[PDB]
């Protein structure tokens, strides 16, 4: 895993010694080279995972997340170079360094075999994200959003540290392979109940769970575009990955202890979806859609069946790609019209036809159109939850309506109808925005051809 | 025929030949506690380093 950490940490001299006019070109070129290099993690075996040393390993669950992260960094570099065009050079280099540090922390978080190292860099991912949100956010409410995000995460995740140190003192090790071969059942006691709660609540907050999701429609809105990409495409999936890793040790208490939380998502993904029917804000609409999809992921993890696990992996990857693309489209509209409200700019298909095509395709992939991997993940979670209980299909099917009921709604008021008369600064679409949309979307449709590389470690 | 001692003669330390034996335990002390075993052997390096969380050394 040293072959990816070292070039990522050498990206900082690359971005700090470059000229004032070629930082973007050099950083995008070398991050695309690292994304190409990332494909050597597909050497997965049907029985054994890929173990590199005592410190790092990568099974078939971490590999799609690593490839997605190192593919996502150049996309952020291309997106965040227009609202920072007038910025000072030193602050531009500091922003690029924050992005590089965030990628380095993420790609060594996804590969740590030891759990306290995973916790340490899982919380080291807080600092660059928070700095980006509270520094390069636009309006006044970025400070409150940063406070909410940081304090929800830390107040949920300090008992996780306490529980992990207790595990290290009790079992004797925190290596994931040793814990895979030394796992003991957890009996029925109040101590084990709070053990389960301390292990679960950090990832509950970072998923987010309904009722603990109040930091999402702030931090996903006040942040800049690259902050929106990392907020919607990696960190939520990082919480899901941690949940998948740590649910191994919490058997068989989970078989009843997951009983409330499933309801807190099974109803929750209804309510937040209904919020998208009556949202006056485009970015808030995308954030609440992310809440609903990740609640579906929560249910899939908590019922702990194989089909649900592969559905959760495919759903996480597909939702990350789709949410990043939707945030890019909303940011392009916000750059053109200088307001975030959805009803201000209407009828943009008459002026911007190809961006309307990208909008249509992104909305179609949002509402789980087959044979996309969004539909594959949603379908597999549906099969597993039907095996769990029958009436759950109702809670699925109604959601299958409401999702489309906002997605096409998001397609209409932003693209269809009569255009706004007084808005006359609708410039034609740049090559950069179209290239960003294509680089977001074409990997998703190509992954629809060969989905078996994202179907989890038990495929 | 008694001679008065001079200065410092009476304050001398003298020896006494006596028949009574030396008390082997005048303080009536009991048995002292056994000390802890000492440290012995060469210093081998620590096995697998510090063994503190994820640190290899």
Short mmCIF file of C-alpha atoms in Angstrom, two decimals, chain A residues 196 243 247 251 254-255 258-259 261-263 266 295-309 312 380-389 392 396:
data_model
loop_
_atom_site.label_atom_id
_atom_site.label_comp_id
_atom_site.label_asym_id
_atom_site.label_seq_id
_atom_site.Cartn_x
_atom_site.Cartn_y
_atom_site.Cartn_z
CA UNK A 196 -23.05 -2.40 20.84
CA UNK A 243 -20.04 -0.37 10.07
CA UNK A 247 -20.51 -5.56 12.90
CA UNK A 251 -23.00 -11.12 17.30
CA UNK A 254 -27.45 -7.44 16.84
CA UNK A 255 -30.30 -9.86 16.06
CA UNK A 258 -30.71 -3.59 15.51
CA UNK A 259 -34.50 -3.66 15.98
CA UNK A 261 -32.52 1.50 14.29
CA UNK A 262 -33.98 -0.35 11.29
CA UNK A 263 -37.33 1.30 12.01
CA UNK A 266 -37.39 2.26 7.43
CA UNK A 295 -30.79 4.97 5.30
CA UNK A 296 -31.54 2.17 2.84
CA UNK A 297 -27.86 1.19 3.17
CA UNK A 298 -28.26 1.20 6.98
CA UNK A 299 -31.16 -1.27 6.79
CA UNK A 300 -29.16 -3.49 4.43
CA UNK A 301 -26.19 -3.59 6.82
CA UNK A 302 -28.31 -4.16 9.91
CA UNK A 303 -30.20 -7.19 8.57
CA UNK A 304 -26.76 -8.80 7.78
CA UNK A 305 -27.50 -11.15 4.91
CA UNK A 306 -25.10 -11.76 1.98
CA UNK A 307 -27.45 -10.31 -0.65
CA UNK A 308 -27.89 -7.19 1.48
CA UNK A 309 -24.11 -6.81 1.78
CA UNK A 312 -24.97 -2.22 0.05
CA UNK A 380 -30.61 -6.62 -3.81
CA UNK A 381 -31.50 -4.69 -0.65
CA UNK A 382 -35.18 -5.17 -1.58
CA UNK A 383 -34.75 -8.96 -1.92
CA UNK A 384 -32.93 -9.19 1.41
CA UNK A 385 -35.47 -7.06 3.27
CA UNK A 386 -38.31 -9.11 1.78
CA UNK A 387 -36.56 -12.17 3.18
CA UNK A 388 -36.34 -10.32 6.52
CA UNK A 389 -40.06 -9.51 6.65
CA UNK A 392 -41.10 -4.14 4.44
CA UNK A 396 -39.79 -0.17 -0.19
#
